[PDB]
Design a protein around this ligand. Structure first.
Ligand SMILES: [Ca+2]
Ligand SMILES: [Ca+2]
Ligand SMILES: [Ca+2]
Ligand SMILES: [Ca+2]
Ligand SMILES: [Ca+2]
Ligand SMILES: [Ca+2]
Ligand SMILES: [Ca+2]
Ligand SMILES: [Zn+2]
Length: 462
């Protein structure tokens, strides 16, 4: 079963960052999304009480203007500045986007579920320029839900320009909602490291509640920080409060030309980095990564990771989400669809497109592109694929995967019945080329790929 390098690149990319199922990664136990979610919510606490799951919540938040004391003992209180307020609201929004939560600001003497405030000194009254931030779990105790940040840190004062600040806000709010660090560790306590992680997926690539960089799991964000909930965070927060099915239910576009009105899902130009795990509750959606020149690998399968804009493992799709279309850039990309009907556009460069199950429409774009098929279920007659811009003598249709059940043979105009034969039929009236494949074990011809344009036998890889 010697398959092509194109098929192999798809086969391997589909297994990129496989997790759970008794696997061992980095010498650690591998957790599935749900296992990581249960670990992150191990304190079993939320604003609805203890051991209460799938229950929505309407919460209040406040930017403290003064304090009688900070619950931690720290001192030198400083209220949130305008930039911190705006970024904190964006962090709150990134959480309410995915879970059934509503946030309403309160002012004056009114109490609030979640509060924000800065500190600058320790209990002894000495300047603290080393710590970052901390927050308290939901509860009925003094300080529950309060979050605090070190004003002496520039990233805390300028969260809109220093990415770690925004990520810190999202992280802290996570605690204020009931989420814990993926492992038993905290700042100030000894000096933990990724080696102390309970499971392999305890890193920024999977959870912003982690303490470890995305590099620990093989990802690379080139010095950037995502700022929004990642895949395991989304599953975790939804475990506690339920999923928000009213978010972006229309046709949504992520990346370039985005209509999300969310900075973390938007790329205004090629120099912008994208780091996100998408939550989308409906409609026909598109991953538009057309503005990059880097060779990208885009996967539309729920729960999967993609390598976008030169970064590694920076984009993922949350469990329970179906993204339909993808657009690559000028680089040599790999686009992998899911079981839904996908429209894939490779763009310039030599791309590898794989529609998977469902009736997909594929555009290789300029360049020497390869349209890959891994099984007869990829393009059944009842839901056939369309390759709309095939270039005879330039593009290729890869059927090497069918070798695992016998080498495919080319027939000119008739099937013998022996099976495992491929045929190209030209429809002069419509200028359409029908690619028929009579697969072994199939009494009837059940595989068909319709091509808008001419195709030669030498363009078909068997
Ligand atoms: Ca949508
Ligand atoms: Ca969708
Ligand atoms: Ca491309
Ligand atoms: Ca598909
Ligand atoms: Ca192309
Ligand atoms: Ca092409
Ligand atoms: Ca298909
Ligand atoms: Zn923390």
């Amino acid at each position: 079963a010697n398959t092509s390098s194109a098929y192999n690149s798809v086969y391997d990319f589909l297994r990129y960052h496989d997790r759970g199922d008794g696997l061992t990664v980095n010498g650690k136990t591998s957790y599935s999304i749900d296992q990581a979610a249960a670990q992150i919510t191990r304190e079993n606490v939320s604003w609805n009480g203890t051991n209460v799951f799938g229950k929505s919540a309407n919460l209040t938040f406040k930017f403290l203007q003064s304090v009688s004391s900070i619950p931690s003992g720290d001192t030198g209180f400083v209220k949130f500045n305008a930039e911190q307020i705006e970024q904190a609201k964006l962090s709150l929004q990134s959480w309410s986007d995915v879970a059934n939560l509503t946030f309403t600001e309160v002012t004056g003497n009114k109490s609030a579920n979640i509060t924000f405030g800065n500190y600058t000194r320790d209990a002894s009254g000495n300047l603290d320029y080393g710590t970052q931030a901390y927050a308290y779990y939901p509860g009925n105790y003094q300080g529950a839900g309060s979050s605090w940040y070190n004003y002496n840190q520039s990233n805390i004062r300028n969260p809109g320009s220093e990415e770690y600040g925004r990520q810190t806000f999202t992280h802290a709010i996570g605690h204020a909602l009931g989420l814990a660090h993926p492992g038993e560790y905290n700042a100030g306590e000894g000096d933990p490291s990724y080696n102390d992680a309970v499971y392999a997926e305890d890193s920024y690539q999977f959870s912003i509640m982690s303490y470890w960089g995305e590099n620990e799991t093989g990802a690379d964000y080139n010095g950037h920080y995502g700022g929004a909930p990642m895949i395991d965070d989304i599953a975790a927060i939804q475990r506690l409060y339920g999923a928000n099915m009213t978010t972006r239910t229309g046709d949504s576009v992520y990346g370039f030309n985005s209509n999300t009105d969310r900075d973390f899902y938007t790329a205004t130009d090629s120099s912008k980095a994208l780091i996100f795990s998408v939550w989308d509750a409906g409609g026909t959606d598109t991953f538009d990564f057309s503005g990059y020149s880097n060779n990208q690998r885009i996967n539309l399968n729920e729960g999967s990771f993609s390598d976008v804009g030169g970064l590694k493992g920076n984009v993922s799709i949350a469990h329970g989400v179906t993204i339909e279309n993808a657009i690559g850039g000028s680089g040599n990309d790999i686009l992998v669809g899911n079981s839904a009907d996908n429209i894939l556009q490779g763009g310039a460069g030599n791309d590898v497109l794989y529609g998977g199950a469902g009736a997909d429409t594929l555009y290789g774009g300029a360049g020497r592109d390869t349209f890959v098929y891994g099984s007869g279920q990829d393009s059944t007659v009842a839901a056939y694929d369309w390759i709309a811009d095939f270039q005879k003598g330039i593009d290729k249709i890869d059927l090497s995967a069918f070798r695992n059940e016998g080498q495919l043979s080319f027939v000119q105009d008739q099937f013998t019945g022996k099976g495992q034969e491929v045929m190209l039929q030209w429809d002069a009236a419509n200028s359409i080329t029908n690619l028929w494949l009579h697969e072994a074990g199939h009494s009837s011809v059940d595989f068909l790929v319709r091509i808008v344009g001419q195709a030669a036998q030498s363009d078909i890889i068997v």
